[PDB]
Amino acid sequence: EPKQLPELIRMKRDGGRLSEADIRGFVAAVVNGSAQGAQIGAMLMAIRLRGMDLEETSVLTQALAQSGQQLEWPEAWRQQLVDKHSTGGVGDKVSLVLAPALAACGCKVPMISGRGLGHTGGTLDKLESIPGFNVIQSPEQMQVLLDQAGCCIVGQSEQLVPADGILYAARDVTATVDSLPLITASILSKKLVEGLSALVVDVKFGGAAVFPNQEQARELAKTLVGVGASLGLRVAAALTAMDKPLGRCVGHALEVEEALLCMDGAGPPDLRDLVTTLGGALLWLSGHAGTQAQGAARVAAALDDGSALGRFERMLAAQGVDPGLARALCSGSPAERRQLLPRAREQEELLAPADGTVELVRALPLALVLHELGAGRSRAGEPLRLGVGAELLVDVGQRLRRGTPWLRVHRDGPALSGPQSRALQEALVLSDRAPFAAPSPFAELVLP
């Protein structure tokens, strides 16, 4: 029954299970206001150090979900509601494209997304690079968006998965993100509130992924598919590598550009690879395409013929962006899009030390330095340096020459410190091996 908050915390601290009553009451305290900051962090920490189990976990997610509302849409759309959701992520703008992609493929995507988590920027912050983009819509507005645009991207609020919003902000600045339960709940809860026909989850592994260990990551996959099943959700989880940044831009505004470059015609191969791959899965899974190949084939199609660029345009406008700016952003050249989005003060470039063959660029050192540069959050509720970020000037598998520039840093301060500099420079790994074509960051596809 109603136990005082400090008491539930004492229980988890002591490795005790939380009852459905206990989890619920807690969730409520968090949304109703009673629960104080130091209390929410304490609990998150306790959880990050004693975990929970299938039930508590399943209970948590399930509750979080109902802290707010659930959406209901015209029965017409039903079989067309789909969504994908990542975990880790350094430079993962897939969402910024796969959304309008699917919307061009006749699907409706009601995306409840999020902000940077730990050292992994969020697709919600990235969108806020676009001037006037509102990530907060009421269910009502959302339904207008899936009608006009077919898709939309919004974050937690007073009506949607409220409690998740409270924790998710804390998780990131409390060093309480890497927890299978808090992860499973955080994700499933949002996607639940949407009520989708099919749902694909992006589970990163290696390098800069929340859970580095491939297998210990593959579990997180069978898990989200696990609980997700029970909750009554069709869930497909795919393990994709995260040792190097997806694409060539890590940041916010920079990333919004490398996304437009995709819809345009095509930018980075890996970026496209996943958008089509994951996209084709959703169509197959939602039973909207013969096989994944066919599925994936239609998405690629969207990419190549301006569809996604169109859907995307309606979307920005539909979500607060000055119509004019939006036609300018999409029909704009890359040079235009640069002068229209947030740019950092100065920007230097790291040169190649030795002749050699780019083996890979270390994602973690990057994300970590850029974080220190204002591309990451230090303490919830704070602005973000949206211009700041980084550009990969060489592509993995290729051969570069000593002295050539391989990475450009956009910073808002008067310079990089010694530690930050060395950090960057060593994130570059060179071999004498012969140049080669980059592999797909896509590994397996855990099914339900």
Author numbering: 32 to 479
Per the authors:
Human thymidine phosphorylase (hTP, EC 2.4.2.4), identified as the sole endothelial mitogenic and angiogenic factor, belongs to the pyrimidine nucleoside phosphorylase (PyNP) family. Thymidine phosphorylase, providing pyrimidine nucleotides for DNA repair and replication, has also been shown to have angiogenic activity in vivo. Here, we report the crystal structures of recombinant native hTP and in complex with 5-iodouracil (5IUR), a substrate with a Ki of 0.48 mM. The active site is located at the interface between the α- and the mixed α/β-domain.
The crystal structure of native hTP (at 3.0 Å) consists of two non-crystallographic dimers in the asymmetric unit. All four copies of hTP contain residues 34–479, residues 32 and 33 can be observed for chains A and B while only residue 33 can be observed for molecule C. At the C-terminal end, residue 480 was observed only in chain B. The crystal structure of hTP–5IUR complex (at 2.5 Å) consists of a dimer per asymmetric unit. No secondary structure differences were observed between native hTP, hTP–5IUR complex structure and the previously reported hTP structures. The crystal structure of unbound hTP provided some interesting findings. Alignment of the molecule A of the two structures (hTP and hTP–5IUR complex) indicates that they align well (including the flexible loop regions and the hinge region), with an rmsd of 0.57 Å over 445 Cα atoms. The ‘key hydrogen bond’ between His150 and Ala239 previously proposed to form the phosphate-binding site is present in both bound and unbound hTP structures. Hence, it is unlikely that only the binding of phosphate would trigger the formation of this key hydrogen bond as it is also observed in structures where a water molecule is present instead of a phosphate ion at the phosphate-binding site. Since no structure is available for the transition states of hTP, it is not possible to say conclusively whether any conformational change occurs during catalysis. It is evident that presence of substrate analogue is not required for the enzyme to acquire the ‘closed’ conformation. However, it is possible that the closed conformation observed for both bound and unbound hTP is favoured by crystal packing, while different ‘conformation/s’ of the enzyme may exist in solution.
